[PDB]
Design a protein around this ligand. Structure first.
Ligand SMILES: [Ca+2]
Length: 160
């Protein structure tokens, strides 16, 4: 598939607060503009005891910086999950040290290469150079055509 995904992943570790530091999409249109249909801002990851992952985020739709709730259900491979929101159905965890940074992608199995959007999340509202280093290292192999990194000030702001 599209993954170079994480092996030996404990989902329960990723629990708590997260900030969208950086994001990137094959199709420019999806991340282009604030209102773009995959311009989502992760707030918190709440992994359920079932082994699934609930994901809390902000998306700009109509005027307000709305806040949605997506549940990524566990598949065969621990590092891949089944969502059904934002016209995506897959969530791939590429890498994470749990403590600082977490790299992941969203894509539609239907059209991966047009649907693929990948975010560098961080634990602290501070642009970590280590996180971005490993993020861009992963994105070299990917066919990304838009790339967005934010600043601590943005990361605290609402649709930051
Ligand atoms: Ca559950």
């Amino acid at each position: 598939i599209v993954t170079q995904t994480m092996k030996g992943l404990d989902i329960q570790k990723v629990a708590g607060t997260w900030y969208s530091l950086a994001m990137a999409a094959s199709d420019i249109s999806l991340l282009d503009a604030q209102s773009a249909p995959l311009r989502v801002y992760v707030e918190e990851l709440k992994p359920t005891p079932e082994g699934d992952l609930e994901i809390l985020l902000q998306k700009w739709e109509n005027g307000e910086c709305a806040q949605k709730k997506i549940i990524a259900e566990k598949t065969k491979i621990p590092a891949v999950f089944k969502i059904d929101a934002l016209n995506e159905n897959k969530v791939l965890v590429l890498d994470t040290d749990y403590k600082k940074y977490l790299l992941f992608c969203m894509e539609n199995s239907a059209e991966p290469e047009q649907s693929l959007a990948c975010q560098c999340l961080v634990r602290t509202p501070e642009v970590d150079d280590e996180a971005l280093e490993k993020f861009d290292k992963a994105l070299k192999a990917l066919p990304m055509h838009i790339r967005l990194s934010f600043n601590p000030t943005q990361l605290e702001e609402q649709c930051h």
